[PDB]
Design a protein around this nucleic acid. Sequence first.
DNA 1: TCGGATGTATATATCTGACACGTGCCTGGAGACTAGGGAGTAATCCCCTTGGCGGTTAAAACGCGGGGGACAGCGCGTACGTGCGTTTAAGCGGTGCTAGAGCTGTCTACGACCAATTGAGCGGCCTCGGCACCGGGATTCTCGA
DNA 2: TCGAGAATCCCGGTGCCGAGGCCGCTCAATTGGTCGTAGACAGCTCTAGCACCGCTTAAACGCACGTACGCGCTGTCCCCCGCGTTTTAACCGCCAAGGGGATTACTCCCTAGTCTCCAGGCACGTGTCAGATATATACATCCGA
Lengths: 94, 94, 108, 52, 371, 100, 79, 80, 98, 96
Amino acid sequence: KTRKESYAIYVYKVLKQVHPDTGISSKAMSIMNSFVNDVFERIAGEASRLAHYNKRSTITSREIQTAVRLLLPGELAKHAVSEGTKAVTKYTSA
Amino acid sequence: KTRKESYAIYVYKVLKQVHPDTGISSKAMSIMNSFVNDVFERIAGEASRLAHYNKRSTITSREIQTAVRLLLPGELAKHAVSEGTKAVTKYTSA
Amino acid sequence: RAKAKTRSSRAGLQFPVGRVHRLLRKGNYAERVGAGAPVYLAAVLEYLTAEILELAGNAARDNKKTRIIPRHLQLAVRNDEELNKLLGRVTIAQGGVLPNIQSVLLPK
Amino acid sequence: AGNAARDNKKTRIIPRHLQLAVRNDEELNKLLGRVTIAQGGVLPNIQSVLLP
Amino acid sequence: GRALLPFDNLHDDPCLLTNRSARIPCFLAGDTRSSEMPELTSMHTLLLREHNRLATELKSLNPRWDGERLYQEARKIVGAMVQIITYRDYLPLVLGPTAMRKYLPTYRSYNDSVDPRIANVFTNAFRYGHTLIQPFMFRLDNRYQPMEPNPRVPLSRVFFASWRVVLEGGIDPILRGLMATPAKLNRQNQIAVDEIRERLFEQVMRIGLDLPALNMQRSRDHGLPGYNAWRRFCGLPQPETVGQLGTVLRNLKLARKLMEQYGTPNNIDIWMGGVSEPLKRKGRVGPLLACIIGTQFRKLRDGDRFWWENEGVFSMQQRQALAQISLPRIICDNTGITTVSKNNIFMSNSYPRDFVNCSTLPALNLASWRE
Amino acid sequence: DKYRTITGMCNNRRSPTLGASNRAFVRWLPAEYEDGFSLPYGWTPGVKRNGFPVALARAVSNEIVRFPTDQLTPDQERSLMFMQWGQLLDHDLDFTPEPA
Amino acid sequence: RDNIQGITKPAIRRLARRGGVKRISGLIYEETRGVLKVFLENVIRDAVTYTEHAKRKTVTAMDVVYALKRQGRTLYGFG
Amino acid sequence: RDNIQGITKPAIRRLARRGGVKRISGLIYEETRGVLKVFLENVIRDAVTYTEHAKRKTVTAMDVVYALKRQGRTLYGFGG
Amino acid sequence: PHRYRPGTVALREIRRYQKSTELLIRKLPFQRLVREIAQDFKTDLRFQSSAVMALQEASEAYLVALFEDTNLCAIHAKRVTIMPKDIQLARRIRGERA
Amino acid sequence: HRYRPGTVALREIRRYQKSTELLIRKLPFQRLVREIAQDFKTDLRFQSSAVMALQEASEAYLVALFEDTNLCAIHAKRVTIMPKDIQLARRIRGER
DNA sequence: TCGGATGTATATATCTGACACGTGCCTGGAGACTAGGGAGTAATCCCCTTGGCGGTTAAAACGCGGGGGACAGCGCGTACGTGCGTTTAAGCGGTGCTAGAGCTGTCTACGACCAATTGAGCGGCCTCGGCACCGGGATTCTCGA
DNA sequence: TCGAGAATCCCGGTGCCGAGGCCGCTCAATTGGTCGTAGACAGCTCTAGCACCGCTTAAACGCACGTACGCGCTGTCCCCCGCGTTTTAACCGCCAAGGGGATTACTCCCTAGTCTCCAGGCACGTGTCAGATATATACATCCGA
Ligand code: HEM
C-alpha cells in the first residue's frame, strides 16, 4: 500500500495524559488532526513572513515566539510562550 | 546609498503606452507599486500552494494559470489568461 | 557572445521578466521555477496595471486634470465591479469615498 | 472536550463535545472564529424577546 | 474535385465585363456582394463546403434523418460556428482588452427588452476595415512560396474577377495567401491606399471610384450627425478649437488639416473622426469607434434568442463540442491545405514560425448529436 | 420555434417584426438634413452648415487620406484574415439597397 | 433539472429553527434558495478548478476542503 | 492624559457626514470614541510587536502596514 | 380537542434542533442539486461521497449562521417575523451582496 | 434668514464626500496614538509616516462603520443613528 | 411661485515646488556549458463510483380554522440642527540637539550535508464493551375552566 | 389556582460494530564528522525624531430657539401557525460493471549551478510648467410672501 502520517498517536498520548479514562472517536480524531495541521501552518507561515521582513535566511525560536504572540489571542498566547520556552531550555541542557 | 528597487519605470512605460500625455504623481506611483507587489504575492502564493497540493516541486505556467483563474474575478481572469498565454507562445518562438 | 537582449523584449512586454524570475526564485515559493512562469506572471501584472491605469486616466480626464492622483485611482477602482471585487479589502490613501446618498434622506 | 463529555455522561469524545469546548471558551472561540467543525451543531441560545 | 459556388444569372453581370475571353459569370450566394474579390468568394466557398461536409457527416451519423432535418441541423451548427469564431477571436482583436471588457461583459441570459436592430451609424462605423486593405492580392503554393504565374496581382485587376477563382488554381492559394500575409497598419498619415482610392472598380465602371469619398458621401446621404455629436453620445469629451482637437487626436498637423477642411469639429464626418483617432492599446479602432462597435455587438448578442450559449438552443455536451471549433481546423479540413496557422488565425502572419500541420489539433466531435 | 426563421421574424415576443429583415434602421441620434427632413448636406450650393461651408468629400479625401504608397507600413500582429473576416461579418450584418 | 426545489420548505424551516428563528415569513424560501445556489456555485466552481488542475475526473473531498479554505471557511473533519 | 477627547464632536460629525449620515444622536460620540480606541489598540499592539522583533526603538511605517495587513486591512500608499 | 397556542411548538422546535447535531436537509435532493450545479462547469464529473458530505456540512453551517444574523436584523426593527429585507441587510453588512 | 433642519446636513454630506483630506486634527490624533502606545513599550519613537498611516486606516474604518450604521438605522425606519445601530453593525460584521 | 439672500461653480492672473529628463556607475541579468534528478509516458490493478431493483414508512403536500403580529394613522414632547459670539489651541515657520538607524568589517559557531544503523510508527488483524435502539413509567409544562 | 393531556425525561434489556490493543516491517529519525557561510558583535556616520517658541487665525465651544422626528398608543386584517389526512419519494439492503485513481519503471528534457561580461536601472542634479492660491462674477438653489 502506502504510508499516511498523521498526528493521531500523539493526540492519543496527550489525551491519556489529561483524561486517562476517556476515549475518542474517529471523527473527533480527524477534527483534532485538522486542527493541529491548521495551527502548524498558521504559525510557520507567520514565522516565515517575519524572517523575510528582516532579511534573515533562518527560522529561529525568536521568529516562532513572535509568531505565537501575534497569532494566539489573549492569555492563551502568554501561556503558550511559557511552554515553548521551557522546552527549548530542557532541550538545550540535555 | 543602498539601491531601492521598485516597479516605477515599468508602470510609467505602461502609462505612456495607454495615455501618452498624462502624468502621474508620487503618491499614485506608491499606490501602483503597492498594488503590483500585492498582486504578485497573491498569485505566487496561490501557485506555490497548488504545487504543494499535487506533490510537485516546480512552479510552471500551468500553476500560474490556475492561480490566475482562482484569484482574479470573472471576465478579468479570462482576459488575463489570454494575455499570459499570448506572451509565453511568443517567448517560445524567439 | 551575442548582444544581450532582455527576456521581456522577446516576449514583447514592458514589465521585467528577469526581475520577476529572481523574485520567484528568492521568495521561497517552490524548489524549482519553470522557464515560462516569469513570462506569464509579467504578462498578467502588465495587463492589470494597464487596465487600472487606463481607468484612472479616463477618470482624471473627466475631471479636466492632467496628472493622476490617488483620488482618480480610487474612482477608477470603485466604479468597476471586477476591480472592486479584486480590491474589496484594500484601502487607498487619500482616496476618499464614492459619492452616494440614500434615497430616504432626500427631501420629498 | 473531556470535561464536556463527562458532563454529558459519556466516555468517548465526539465532535459535539469539541464544538461545545471551543464555543464556550472566549480565547479558543476567537482563535477558531472562522472554522466549521463537522457534526458539531450549535450553542443553545434563544433571544429573550422571543420567550413568552 | 471540390465544390464551388453555384452560378448566377443577371441582366448586367460585371464578372463577364471584367474579362470577355474567359466568360465566367458572377457566383450566387446569400449576398449579392459575394464576388467583389476572390477572397470573399473563397470564404463563401469554404463556408458552403463546411455546411455540405457537416450535412454528409450528420447523414452518416444519423441515417434515419430527413433532408430537411439535416439542413436545419447543419444550419444551426454553422450559425453557432460563425458566432463562436467572431465573438471569441475577432472582436477582442478589434476592440482590445479594455473596450471588449467594458462593452461586452460576461454573457448572462437572453433579454427580450433589448433591440437587436442594426443602427444607422454602424453601417458607417464598421468601415474601419477599409484602412486595413493591402494594395495587392497574394497567392501562395503548397510550400507557402510565391505561386506562379502572377504571385502578386494589383487590387485594381481583381475586382469582380470571378474567373480568377475557377481558372486560376481555385481557392487554396487565396486562403494560403490570406493566412500568411500581414495586414496594413492604420497610421494617422497613412489612412487608405491609392488602389481603392483612385482605381476602385476601374474596369467595370467608366471611371475609378474613391472609397473614402464614397464613405463620407454616404454618411452625408444617411443624414448622420457630426463627430462631436457622437463624441457626446458615447461620453467622450467634445473638442471645440484647434488645440482641443489636437489634444484629442494626439496630432497637430492632422487637426490643422481637419479644421482647414471642415472649419469646426462639429462638422467632421463620423468615418473621418473614427479613423483619424489614435488606436486603442492592442486594438485597431479609436475610442469612439470602439464604443459604437461594442454597443452594437452587445445588442446583437443580448437580443438574439437563438444565441449559441442560450439555454435550450444546444445541449451541454453540444456546447462543449462546439467550444472547441477553430478557423484553421475548418480551413485545413474542407480543402487541400495541410499547413495552417495556430491559436488566433487573425494574429499569425509569418511562415513558418507560427504554423502547424493541423494533424495535431482536434476536430469537431459530432458524437453528441445522436438522437 | 426549434430553428431560426429565414427572415428573422417573430424573434422578439414583444415586437415580432423588430430585428427582422427589410425594415428601417434604428437611429441612435436624430438625423440632420440641410432642409430638416430629407435633403442631404451639399445638395444646394451656398448653404452653410452651422455657419461653415460644406466641404467636398472628394477634396477631403484628396488632402487628408491621400499618402504616397511607397511608405506603406505592414501590421506586425495581424493577417489578412482579419480584414476578410471583418468584411464577411459585415456582409452578414447589414446591407443598404439603393434604386437601380 | 429543477433540483433547487428539492430543498423543501420544511427543510428551510428546520435550518431556521436551529438558528433561533421563531416566526417565519412566507417569502424567505425563494430568497434562501437563491442564497444557497450562489454559495454552492462559488464553492463548486473553485473545487472543479482544483480538480481540473490535477488532471482528474473525480472531485475529491480535499478539493472541496481547499475551495472552502480559500474563501475563509475552513472546515474541520474531512482531512 | 485624557487625549481620547482630542477626537472632538465636530470631527466625529464630519466622519459621519462622509459616510452619508444625515441626523446623529447625542450618545454616538462616546460609542465612536470607544470603537476607535479599540481599533487603535489592536493595530498599535501588533505594530509594536513587529518593531520589538526587529530590535528597534522607532515604529516605522512598514510595521504599521504589516500590522494592518495582518487584520485584513491592506493599506496602499505607505511603504511597499 | 387539544390545541397549542402559536409559538409554543415553534419554541419546542427551536430547543430540539439546537440540541441535535444531525443534518437538516435530505441527502439525495442535495446530491442531485450539487451534481446539476457542477454540470455547468464540467461534463461527466464524478463525486466522492465525502465531497458531497463536506459540501452539505458547509452549506448547512453557512445557512444557520446567516439565519442567526437575519434574526438579529429582524429583532432590531421591533419584529418577530423574518422577512427577506433582513436577509438582504445581513448579507450587505457581512460584505457579500455589498 | 434660516435654513430648515436637514438642509445644511445634506450640504455637508455633499461637501465631505467630494474631498479626500483627513477629517481629524493631526496633533490630537498623534497624542492619542502616543498615549495608546505608552501601554506597550516605554520611550517609543514614531516615524511621521507611521502616524499618518494610522490616521488613514482609522478614518477609513470609521467611515465604513458609519455607512453600515446608516444602513442599520434606515432598516428600522429611522433617520438618526443611535448606538444600537453601531452595535448591530459591529456584531453582524463579526467584531462583537 | 416671483423676488431676495446665500452658497458654489467659473473664468482670469501669480507663483512655486515637484515631476520629468540627463548623466555617471555598478551590479544584477544574459550568454555559454555541464550534470542529474523531476516528471512525463506507458502498463497493470483493484476499488469505489454509478446504475438498478424492491419494500417499508417517514417525511413532504395540502387544506382549514383562527389569533396575534404587521402596518398604518395620530398626537406629543423633547432633543438635535442652525446661527452667533467668544475662547483656544492647531498649524506654520524657524532653531537646536542627539538618539539610533543604517552601513562596514571581522570572525566563529551553527546549520546543511553526507553515510551507516535501527526502532518508531503505520498497516493489517481481532475482539469486546460503549452506545444506539427498544420498551415502559415518571415528571413537567401547557392551556382551558 | 387546578386538572386533563401531550411531550420530554429517565431508567432497565439487547445486540453490534467501531475503538483499542497486538505483531511485522520498513523507512525516516538518530549519531558521528566536515565545511562554509549567515549572523553576531563593535565602530562610525549622519538622518530624522523630539523639544521649544511666537503668531495668526481657523476650529472648537457654549448658548438660545424652534421644529421635526422618535415613540407610545389604538385599530384592523391578513397571514402565518398548529393539526389532521393523504401522497410521495427518501432510505436501506443487495448486485453487477467498469471507469479511473494509484503504483512501478524508465528514460528524456529541463532546470540549477558557475564564470564573464556588459547594459539596464538606480541615485543625484536641474529647471519649467501643472496646479494651488486670490478675486471678482454668474448662476443655482432654498425659504418665504
Ligand atoms: C478589401 C476590399 C473591399 C472593397 C473593394 C470594398 C468595397 C466596398 C464598396 C465599393 C462599398 C460601397 C461604398 C458605399 O456606397 O458605401 C462597400 C460597402 C461597405 N463595406 Fe466594403 N469593401 C472592402 C472591404 C471591406 C471591409 C474589410 C469592411 C469591414 C471590416 C467593409 C465594410 C463595408 C461596409 C460597412 C459597407 C457599407 C454597406 C452598405 O452601406 O450597404 N468593406 N464596400
